[PDB]
Amino acid sequence: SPEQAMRERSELARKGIARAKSVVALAYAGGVLFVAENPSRSLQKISELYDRVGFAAAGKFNEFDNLRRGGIQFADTRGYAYDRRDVTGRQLANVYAQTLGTIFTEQAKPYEVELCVAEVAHYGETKRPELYRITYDGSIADEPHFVVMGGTTEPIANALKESYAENASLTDALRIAVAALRALGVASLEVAVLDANRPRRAFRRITGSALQALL
Amino acid sequence: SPEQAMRERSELARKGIARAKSVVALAYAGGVLFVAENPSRSLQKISELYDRVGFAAAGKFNEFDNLRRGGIQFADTRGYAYDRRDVTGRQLANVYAQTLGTIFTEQAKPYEVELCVAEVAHYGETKRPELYRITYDGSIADEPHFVVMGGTTEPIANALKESYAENASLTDALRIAVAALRALGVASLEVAVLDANRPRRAFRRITGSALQALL
Amino acid sequence: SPEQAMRERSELARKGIARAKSVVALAYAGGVLFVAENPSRSLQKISELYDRVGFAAAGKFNEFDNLRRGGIQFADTRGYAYDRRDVTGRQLANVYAQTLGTIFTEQAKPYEVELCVAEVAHYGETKRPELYRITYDGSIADEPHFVVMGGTTEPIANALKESYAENASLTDALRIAVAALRALGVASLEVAVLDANRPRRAFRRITGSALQALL
Amino acid sequence: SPEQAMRERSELARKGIARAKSVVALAYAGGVLFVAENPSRSLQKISELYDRVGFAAAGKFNEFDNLRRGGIQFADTRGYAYDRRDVTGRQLANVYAQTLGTIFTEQAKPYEVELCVAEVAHYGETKRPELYRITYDGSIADEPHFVVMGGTTEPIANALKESYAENASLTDALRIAVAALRALGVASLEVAVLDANRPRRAFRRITGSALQALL
Amino acid sequence: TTIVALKYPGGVVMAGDRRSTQGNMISGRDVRKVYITDDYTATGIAGTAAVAVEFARLYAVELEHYEKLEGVPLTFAGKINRLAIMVRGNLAAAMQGLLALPLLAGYDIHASDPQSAGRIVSFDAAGGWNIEEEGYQAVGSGSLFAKSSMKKLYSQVTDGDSGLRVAVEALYDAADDDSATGGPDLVRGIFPTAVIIDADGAVDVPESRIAELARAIIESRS
Amino acid sequence: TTIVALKYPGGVVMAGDRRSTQGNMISGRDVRKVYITDDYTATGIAGTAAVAVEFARLYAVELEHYEKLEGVPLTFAGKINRLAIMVRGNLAAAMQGLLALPLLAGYDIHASDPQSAGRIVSFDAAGGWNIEEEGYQAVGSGSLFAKSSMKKLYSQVTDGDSGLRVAVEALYDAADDDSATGGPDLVRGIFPTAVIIDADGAVDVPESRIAELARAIIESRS
Amino acid sequence: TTIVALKYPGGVVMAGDRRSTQGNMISGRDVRKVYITDDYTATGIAGTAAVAVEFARLYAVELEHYEKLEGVPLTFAGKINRLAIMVRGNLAAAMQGLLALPLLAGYDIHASDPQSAGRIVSFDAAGGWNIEEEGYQAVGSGSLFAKSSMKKLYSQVTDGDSGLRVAVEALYDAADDDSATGGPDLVRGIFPTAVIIDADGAVDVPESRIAELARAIIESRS
Amino acid sequence: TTIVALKYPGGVVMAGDRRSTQGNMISGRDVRKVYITDDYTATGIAGTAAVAVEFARLYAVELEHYEKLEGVPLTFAGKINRLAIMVRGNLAAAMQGLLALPLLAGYDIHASDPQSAGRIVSFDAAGGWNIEEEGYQAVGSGSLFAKSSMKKLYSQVTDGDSGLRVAVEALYDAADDDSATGGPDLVRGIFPTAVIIDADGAVDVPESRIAELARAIIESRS
Ligand SMILES: CC(C)C[C@H](NC(=O)CNC(=O)c1cc(Cl)ccc1Cl)B(O)O
Ligand SMILES: CC(C)C[C@H](NC(=O)CNC(=O)c1cc(Cl)ccc1Cl)B(O)O
Ligand SMILES: CC(C)C[C@H](NC(=O)CNC(=O)c1cc(Cl)ccc1Cl)B(O)O
Ligand SMILES: CC(C)C[C@H](NC(=O)CNC(=O)c1cc(Cl)ccc1Cl)B(O)O
């Protein structure tokens, strides 16, 4: 029966997601902030897709690494095809949703991943940042405030909802995200930002002495 | 047994359709009006296929987005092949029915979608608008007055049948559709029209202050 | 049910790993040291991948020999593609993880192998050696101190953890590794080193009278 | 379950091997000696692969005949590719192991064969002969003294172990092998040798009056 | 070879000659060069005979196939596009010596004004098409003489009879000036062929009317 | 063939002639060589007629297809890239005798300053494109004469009327110096065609204004 | 076309002219021929314009793609190999009339000595590359005159200002000796373009400094 | 271009010049034409520069790949066969103007007599190879003069120093007789490059010894 197969695959994906760590994406005055708990300094969960697009993932590393590489390929080929300013995060989210749906339908084992795509405005412009969340089955949703993926997200979601403040500063948003995730020093922490004030490329990492100074 | 497989697939499609929102397409003096309940401003359920053809869908977004893209491809290739005036909505409806039947027969998981195609007359001509409804299994039907898809359609269908008035105005038809769907402000509302009085392209969206003024 | 299939395949791989010998990789002041218990002088378990990359494996010989050959092919083609200094061990580890995951997912019988990739710094530079461990299912991990694979690793891991000393000499590290593995003369021993002080190629074997002198 | 399939296939291969005759390969001062019990004068079990490589097989004739032909093809193509002196028995053993593993994994019915590859030194050189044994599942082992395949090998192995003498003569080794196999006149006997004293080609058969004279 | 087409208030008229030659040798005396593609369209092709017949039969089959498949006939622009594609596909064979040049006449039933519903379309060797607006067109090797005759004789056209007479006179002038065009034959009784398209459809003209017109023209010139 | 384009404060104006020739023989008198691709862009192609119409229809379809697929129109650089790719793909056919050279005019709605929002782009046979910064450009066989006339007449342009008059004068000079360019016809009443693009979109110019301007220029020259 | 590059203690400077010609006719007056590929590398291509822009955009995209994929930028030898492969792939198109010749300048951040970190690489039509060790290089049709001028003017270079002045003087000499190279324009105000690469990255030189240097050189020569 | 190789009791010595030309114009002054393929083999290629570097890098990668794959290095005959296959594969490109001719020198460690372990192999454009038995060989455009000089100077070779001096003298004679070969430069300080292979491996010769030998030879000739 198709029902039993779909239920079993969904349960497998749910367990795989539940036995993973937590990634949190927030929107502040300067743009988008990604915070994850990762001890390793060689394997990364937050990456840059294009000039103003950022990618976050939760789950198995070798499963979303391929998705990240494919997204970069799509973005570069489209940018060379028409123009750099004709690339948006909605197209990447749609491509990811289609790929995840096809994998969940046809492949023997579904992918245990949760994806988030963030986009900010171009230089010299005012626009609300956009956050899209994609699940294992291919569902795509738009989140206006924050995204929390991986592990037990209910306490983190409740803490963020009670503590979220719009137009917050970088330090305040970082402290709020850290407090929400705790419910974590220089080690076992990965912090990235999409700087809307940067001219062309907006993605940058905050690691080392600067992270401790801002913590 | 083939019977059990077909019954299980039909039940899955029925549940998928039943757990979705409602889309309503009406015919008024100015043409065709599409009304849907959609909170997101980035994902759309009503679209334009050609100069005088409009497309509406209910179900999973990533499932009917592919169908919409395929329909646009067919229409543009046929228009370049022979002429722009040789493209009609019946051909698109037949193509959609064939594709949906093939998917329901061969693919492992059937599509949980419900499609509606609307066509109006050319500029300077008088003709009744045509509405076609396509289901998951490939059945195609012609509706003279209105189409209601998605969710529990029985109360909405009864309200529309009791309240339908031919040759109604735009504001009256919009209010009647809203009342039928309630049994809904600027937010969580998607309204589109096929303007038969427009010279070449008839599809246009009504959003923002104009929607509130007409509501 | 997918759960039962995955559990059975994992159990088969676990038994295959458990019925094998033990390989130990340590980091000392001069670089990386590989120690294995192998009586045969014609079949080897420790090999060189590139100028500063070393490969170790535990399990079935004919299963990881193919992986070793593929890794050498990837490294030589990439080195000719861009440059010799653009090749790192992380890329090889990622390729191995992807290949092992694909084999575990699609192939009828999973591979009963455990892989370790070691990398040292270039000549005239100071950098911590990197050790990556790859399992049968495709999981990849980074180990800062030592790697123990194959057989019953718990007593060996405990002995190494209690006896590990940073910045140790070659003789002391070799004796410590031998003592940990015992809990072994010239015969049934395979010892290799990645010499960070060598100009271009760092891999070299220690066999014969030198091994007895250092033992 | 994969376990039951692997167990059943292994049991089938074990029965097929057990219901076959016995082949014995020994190492003496002049090189390698192959002795088999074969009444037919047209179907042979001992063959030559290259200048200094010899092949022996136990099991179904039509199953290892194909393997022998493939090995000859590999050796001739490699010899023409680089040189005649760049061909060794270890490469042939590895190729045979890979082929047998692939057959045991993918093919519907596993091969009921046991293979032995022997190599001697070049002319004017001193080196220990090498003997490799390959089983149905793809396992490859190195034997320093002797190889016994097919049928009930335990009494033959015990007799050879108790009676083996290093640096023996041709007649003494032949008599010892015959005595071990008995626990056999001109008929139903196949004897071959790899003569290390021959200039280029080392394989030669001993049949007819010479065999009786040496018996 | 010369094929003429012209417009009159109410419709169109197309006419063609009957001579086929192989170099300077006369090979055919009663060849028909004008076809009725459908109820409201006529085509005339000049050049290699085999290519012309193949093009005509293929065009008719394609139009009928579309009409049967879709349940509705094509519009005029669609037919023009199909003919242009067919012509463009023969460019490689048009070079090296297999050339066919068509001319199209038709009546548009979707036009608002029934009087100005006749259309004449000309084509070039590369597949480009042009819609005439002067009221007449000619194709073939004697097209220049026929066009120059129509330029002076077009002021007399009032209805179908006038247009048919003008077309016959233009064909006569083209045959007078060109040796590859066949004139009226009175010894044998062979005359050009004409098709008239109007609101009721496309009809072949009987040979008696054309014979009478040709005899009148010959008497006038004598 | 000559197509001119120029900039005025507020937008752009593009103009073209109507003559089509086959060697030294006149074949067409009322050909239209300027198209409206979308709401803010106009294109003019010179060369083989069939290739030009094919290129225009294909470009329009591609732009509309992208707009319908993505729900947002392309930027100016994307349109330039698409046109350059289309031109580059015809290099092999550009050799041996099927050549088409386009010229693009547009209005950028994303520009910070609405006054300096008009753009003119020229192309070469290999697919290279250039954005003009002098304020005018011409394409075709009579482009040199038109450019030399605009070089002297550009100081008078102040608004749309001045630019249209200058464009008509440049076309008149090009027709005076070149025999493959059609001048104004007063016997028949055929005049060049113009398109004006500004912040409200692209609009075709009515023929009465162009006729008045041409008559004034002819009277001035007499 | 002439592009020059030279080394000074601390980095490199690259300069190029702005003239584009079609035979003996001047087609472009303000063409930019120098690009910033990444934070520490500049490229200048001579030959067919379209091929040059295509090569530049492709090289930049490839470098950015590798940097994003691997998380670490390529080394200098890898970039040289990629550029050499790109040049070698165009050999067939380099023959028959689509030729592009690049020149590369860069700053190596992995060099032990920061003073001697500037690198200049030249290429040939077959894909062979050479690393310069004399301190200067020129590409284009006027490269010989520029090289002969730098051979005498190189003893004055001490820092970035001296190198920029020498580069402008070499470009002036090349324009003096070659008619396909554009010299300074004082009527219009168009000057060559320069890029300076040092330990802080690659920066475009403002036009005021180049105008001042060109005016000083012109006054000196007068 | 001239590359020489010769045998001495104990090993082999190979030497090469540094001039690169483009017709009659000097393009390069310090080109290196001799490579160390592995621990006991050296190769020198003459002809097109890019093909030579590509061949060298490919040969080195192939040898290293085989050594890593099989765990044992190839024999001398296998290396000769691989090089011959590589040369034979370029025959089509050798015609029409991309030609590369190699020369190989090596030390055989499997030879019974260590004294007679040096090997010199020459190749032809079709892929045929020959093992020298006279003790010396030269490749390039000036190979005839170098061979004729070695034919007279070979009686003096006793050890490595004598062989190196003879090789430098042969290169000097080749540069004296040929204009495409670079001689010693005393103004700049550029000298030929040499590699010596013996039982301990292959080592590059320091430039001071070659400079001293060249100065002694120049003084002797003066
Ligand atoms: C419809 C067609 C008759 C048009 C005319 N063309 C020709 O007659 C050309 N002739 C032949 O093709 C031909 C006829 C025969 Cl019988 C044998 C060989 C040849 Cl080569 B026209 O004058 O343009
Ligand atoms: C838009 C286009 C009219 C441009 C102009 N080109 C031509 O007129 C070239 N002419 C033909 O292509 C052509 C026309 C016909 Cl009717 C028959 C055969 C030929 Cl070969 B122009 O002057 O550059
Ligand atoms: C960057 C580039 C301007 C370099 C220079 N090359 C050219 O100018 C060659 N010219 C064209 O390619 C060209 C330009 C146009 Cl506008 C029209 C047709 C042609 Cl054919 B140079 O002097 O080497
Ligand atoms: C190793 C190599 C320098 C050998 C020598 N060959 C050449 O120098 C031939 N020259 C070029 O290939 C070449 C060099 C440049 Cl810089 C530009 C264009 C060309 Cl076409 B030799 O004398 O045989």
Short mmCIF file of C-alpha atoms in Angstrom, two decimals, chain F residues 12-102:
data_model
loop_
_atom_site.label_atom_id
_atom_site.label_comp_id
_atom_site.label_asym_id
_atom_site.label_seq_id
_atom_site.Cartn_x
_atom_site.Cartn_y
_atom_site.Cartn_z
CA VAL F 12 14.41 58.22 -27.40
CA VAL F 13 13.12 58.36 -30.97
CA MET F 14 13.73 55.82 -33.76
CA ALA F 15 12.92 56.23 -37.46
CA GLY F 16 13.16 54.14 -40.61
CA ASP F 17 12.47 54.18 -44.34
CA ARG F 18 10.23 51.98 -46.51
CA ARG F 19 12.15 50.94 -49.65
CA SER F 20 12.96 47.32 -50.50
CA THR F 21 15.13 46.50 -53.52
CA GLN F 22 16.37 43.40 -55.35
CA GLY F 23 19.62 44.54 -56.93
CA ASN F 24 18.78 47.64 -58.97
CA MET F 25 15.07 46.75 -59.26
CA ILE F 26 12.56 48.24 -56.82
CA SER F 27 10.50 45.47 -55.20
CA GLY F 28 8.72 47.06 -52.23
CA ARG F 29 7.45 50.56 -51.48
CA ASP F 30 5.76 50.37 -48.05
CA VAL F 31 7.91 48.00 -45.99
CA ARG F 32 7.92 48.53 -42.22
CA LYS F 33 11.35 48.13 -40.63
CA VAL F 34 10.75 49.26 -37.01
CA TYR F 35 9.11 47.06 -34.37
CA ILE F 36 7.94 47.53 -30.78
CA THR F 37 9.42 44.60 -28.85
CA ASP F 38 7.86 45.43 -25.48
CA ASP F 39 6.55 48.38 -23.45
CA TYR F 40 9.93 50.15 -23.31
CA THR F 41 12.11 48.76 -26.12
CA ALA F 42 12.26 49.13 -29.91
CA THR F 43 14.40 47.28 -32.45
CA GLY F 44 15.36 47.96 -36.06
CA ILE F 45 17.07 45.36 -38.26
CA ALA F 46 18.79 45.89 -41.62
CA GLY F 47 19.76 43.30 -44.21
CA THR F 48 17.86 40.31 -45.57
CA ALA F 49 14.14 40.84 -44.98
CA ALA F 50 13.21 37.28 -43.99
CA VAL F 51 16.04 37.03 -41.45
CA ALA F 52 15.00 40.39 -40.00
CA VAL F 53 11.35 39.41 -39.50
CA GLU F 54 12.38 36.04 -38.07
CA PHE F 55 14.79 37.70 -35.64
CA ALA F 56 12.18 40.24 -34.55
CA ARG F 57 9.39 37.72 -33.96
CA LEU F 58 11.79 35.38 -32.13
CA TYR F 59 13.12 38.16 -29.88
CA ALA F 60 9.61 39.29 -28.96
CA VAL F 61 8.51 35.72 -28.19
CA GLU F 62 11.60 35.09 -26.05
CA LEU F 63 11.08 38.27 -24.01
CA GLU F 64 7.39 37.50 -23.45
CA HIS F 65 8.20 33.90 -22.53
CA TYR F 66 10.70 34.96 -19.87
CA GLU F 67 8.30 37.58 -18.49
CA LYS F 68 5.49 35.02 -18.19
CA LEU F 69 7.74 32.31 -16.71
CA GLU F 70 9.49 34.37 -14.02
CA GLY F 71 6.72 36.87 -13.26
CA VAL F 72 9.15 39.79 -13.64
CA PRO F 73 10.63 41.43 -16.77
CA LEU F 74 14.29 41.19 -17.68
CA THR F 75 16.76 43.99 -17.04
CA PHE F 76 18.35 45.94 -19.88
CA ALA F 77 21.66 44.05 -19.70
CA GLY F 78 19.82 40.74 -19.95
CA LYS F 79 17.99 41.88 -23.09
CA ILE F 80 21.29 43.07 -24.58
CA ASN F 81 22.87 39.69 -23.81
CA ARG F 82 19.98 37.78 -25.39
CA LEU F 83 20.12 39.91 -28.54
CA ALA F 84 23.91 39.51 -28.73
CA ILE F 85 23.58 35.72 -28.42
CA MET F 86 20.94 35.69 -31.17
CA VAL F 87 23.21 37.75 -33.44
CA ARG F 88 26.27 35.62 -32.66
CA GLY F 89 24.39 32.43 -33.55
CA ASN F 90 23.86 33.59 -37.15
CA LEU F 91 27.55 34.14 -37.99
CA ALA F 92 27.73 31.09 -40.27
CA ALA F 93 24.57 32.20 -42.07
CA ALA F 94 25.78 35.82 -41.96
CA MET F 95 28.56 34.61 -44.22
CA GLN F 96 27.50 33.32 -47.68
CA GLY F 97 24.65 35.83 -47.86
CA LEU F 98 22.10 35.88 -45.00
CA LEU F 99 23.07 38.90 -42.89
CA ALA F 100 21.01 40.83 -40.34
CA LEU F 101 22.27 43.78 -38.28
CA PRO F 102 20.08 45.12 -35.44
#
